């Protein structure tokens, strides 16, 4: 069970995205090669105090 986040600030926050650098970490190779790369989890900030 997960809770959908809410925007609390004017600025946008960090998000995980596919870019030209990491494009081919998420698709197979010509001979079927596959990999799964590590992804971060706590991208958005929250105020401690």
């Amino acid at each position, epitope marked *: 069970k997960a809770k959908l986040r809410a925007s609390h600030t004017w600025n946008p926050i960090q998000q995980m995205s596919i870019n*030209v*650098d990491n494009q*081919f970490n998420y698709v197979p190779s*010509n001979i079927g090669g596959m990999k799964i790369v590590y992804e971060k989890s706590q991208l958005a900030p929250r105020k401690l105090y």
Partner: antibody, heavy 126, light 109 residues
Framework: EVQLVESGGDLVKPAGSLRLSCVAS????????MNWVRQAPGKGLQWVAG???????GYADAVKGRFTISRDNAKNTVYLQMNSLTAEDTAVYYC????????????????????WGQGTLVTVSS | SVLTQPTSVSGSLGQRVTISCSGS????????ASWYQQLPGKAPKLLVY???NRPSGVPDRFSGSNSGNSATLTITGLQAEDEADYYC???????????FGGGTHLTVL
């Protein structure tokens, strides 16, 4: 306008190693490949290595087993790592940009350097 | 794979100059040559693309063509600005190796 600046030249022993760096600006760095072309004193241009957006690299047969090239698109920088240098490697190395937009594994089918840097000198001797 | 160029070519002011680069079906027969200009001690400059186009600001004096395994660069209305060294560049698609020519020195009379 597109501008490139190199660095890293030095004098090393006949069996040492060295690393060079270029800094680029003025264009979509991730869309175009960057290449290392060298010129021995009094001789013609010679290609060394090239790297594309996703980290894919190509090396000439003269350096394929020794050298290594890399990028950092977040810093618009390209590096070349040379190992097991020999005297013949002595040359001024030029950093250039491709005219054509290629990103992934299937580049090096059409290359044309359209902008150039200033060059850095590599000397291999005792 | 390596490309072949003549060591030097000579022409007089106002005439036409031709520089020839020879390759193979593997390099020039698929991707035509691209021509570069190098003043003594300076960084090279691109003159004519593989398709005959020129970078912005290059005079129409410079032109190129491809036939079979050989390419040529034609300089028309030779001026004093053209005394330099010229190179042909092509890429081998079979091997993925970029090939330059040996270079040719241009003498203006």
């Amino acid at each position: 306008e597109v501008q490139l600046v190199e660095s890293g030249g030095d004098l090393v022993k006949p069996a040492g190693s060295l690393r060079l760096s270029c800094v680029a600006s003025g264009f979509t760095f991730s869309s175009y490949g960057m290449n290392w072309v060298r010129q021995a004193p009094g001789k013609g241009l010679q290609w060394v290595a090239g790297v594309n957006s996703g980290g894919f690299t190509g090396y000439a047969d003269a350096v394929k087993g020794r050298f290594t090239i890399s990028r950092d698109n977040a810093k618009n920088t390209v590096y070349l790592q040379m190992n097991s240098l020999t005297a013949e490697d002595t040359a001024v190395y030029y950093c250039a940009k491709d005219r054509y937009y290629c990103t992934g594994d299937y580049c090096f089918n059409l290359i044309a350097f359209g902008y150039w840097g200033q060059g850095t000198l590599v000397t291999v001797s005792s | 794979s390596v490309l072949t160029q003549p060591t030097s070519v000579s022409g007089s002011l106002g005439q036409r100059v031709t520089i020839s680069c020879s390759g193979s079906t593997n390099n020039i027969g698929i991707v035509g040559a691209s021509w570069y200009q190098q003043l003594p001690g300076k960084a090279p400059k691109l003159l004519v693309y593989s398709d005959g186009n020129r970078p912005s600001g290059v005079p129409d004096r410079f032109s190129g063509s491809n036939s079979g395994n050989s390419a040529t660069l034609t300089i028309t209305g030779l001026q004093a600005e053209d005394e330099a060294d010229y190179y042909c560049q092509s890429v081998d698609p079979t091997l993925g190796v970029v090939v330059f020519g040996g270079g040719t020195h241009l003498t203006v009379l």
